[PDB]
């Protein structure tokens, strides 16, 4: 509903689609979105622009696609244009995939340009192993582990990837996975 981790440098977030643009400014509680009001079990894509103001002028830090997955209770940011403030000083066309979402958590699928992904995982309360397929990457397995509040007051899987790292958060009555292949380190999500 409210995504504060998707904002950069305490700036703005202009998501724009269908001839409408809403700017979520950080530091204000009025920013909100659909708590599953958009279609569930479907990736809804938005065009986002991250901006800050320096000495009375707005500067775009990044832009690209912004996709969400809806359930009863994962935000993904496909950057297409980011700034090289360290070397070039120019807004380059560098493409990078990230995950910056969370929802309503309880207390106790997609990848880069690959919308058709299946998340088939199971876990039993022994104290989370899962298999992920239907992707460009050949053969990825989530490694089972224990769960705890971990100071987040919510159960967290904090599993691994098979040499990897995965994180799945329980909700209801949602996750992100990092994998490293030979070609590049691919970012995968769980839903």
């Amino acid at each position: 509903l409210t995504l504060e981790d998707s904002i950069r440098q305490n700036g703005t977030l202009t998501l724009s689609a269908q001839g409408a643009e809403k700017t979520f400014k950080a530091g204000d509680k009025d920013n909100s979105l659909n708590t599953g009001k958009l279609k569930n079990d479907k990736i809804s894509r938005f065009d986002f622009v991250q901006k800050i103001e320096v000495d009375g002028q707005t500067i775009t830090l990044a832009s690209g696609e912004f996709q969400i997955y809806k359930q009863n209770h994962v935000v993904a940011l496909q950057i297409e244009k980011i700034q090289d403030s360290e070397h070039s000083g120019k807004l380059v066309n560098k493409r990078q995939f990230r995950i910056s979402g969370l929802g309503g958590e309880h207390t106790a699928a997609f990848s880069s340009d690959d919308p058709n992904g299946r998340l088939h995982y199971s876990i039993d309360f022994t104290k989370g192993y899962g298999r992920i397929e239907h992707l460009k990457t050949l053969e990825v397995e989530l490694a089972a582990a224990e769960l705890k509040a971990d100071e987040k007051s919510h159960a967290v899987i904090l599993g691994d990837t098979r040499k990897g790292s995965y994180h799945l958060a329980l909700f209801g009555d949602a996750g992100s996975a990092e994998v490293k292949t030979v070609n590049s380190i691919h970012h995968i999500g769980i839903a």
Partner: antibody
Amino acid sequence: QVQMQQPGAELVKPGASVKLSCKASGYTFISYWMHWVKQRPGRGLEWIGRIAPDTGIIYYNEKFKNKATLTVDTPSSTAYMQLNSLTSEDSAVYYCARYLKYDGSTYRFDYWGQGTTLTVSS
Amino acid sequence: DIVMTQAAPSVPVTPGESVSISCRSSKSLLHSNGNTYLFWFLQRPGQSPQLLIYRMSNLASGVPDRFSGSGSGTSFTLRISRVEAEDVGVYYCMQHLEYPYTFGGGTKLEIKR
């Protein structure tokens, strides 16, 4: 307002070293790179190098690799430039200029220091 | 290094007419992002260079409407629609697409009166 103060002139003996300063005021100093430009007497503007007070990186012109040394002090909002083993061909005017680290602004080379007239002679 | 050439060393003009100052590059100053990184500068005698045109065509804050910017890849021109006497000075083009940033030679505006 944005003001960049440079010493009017500086005389030194040949073979010595000099550290030119360029103070800054009126803008978020860490967000802007600092470029240095030499204009010799007669004609010609040479770009020397840029220094980033945020990243600490210096990009330099190879012609001034062993001639120029760029340092910055963010607290004092001043950038420095040390010239080394000075010869007669270094008698020139040296400018500083701000350059926002971000693309898409009107804040690149839009404010220039008044210049430092460096005369090197015995 | 990119080589900026200003073929005209000086151009004469009578007050009220139009002037064109040109500048050529060794390589296209168009980046893949589509932005052409070219600046136009005016250096008045005994003064620091002053930004006139940015992004090859966009006028800079404080620059009079008389000044105009145009260009392509490897070809760029600055235009003064009606030249006044305050426009006397040397005009410098400059690339900032690649290090080292390089200036042009400079074209002096001469006023025939």
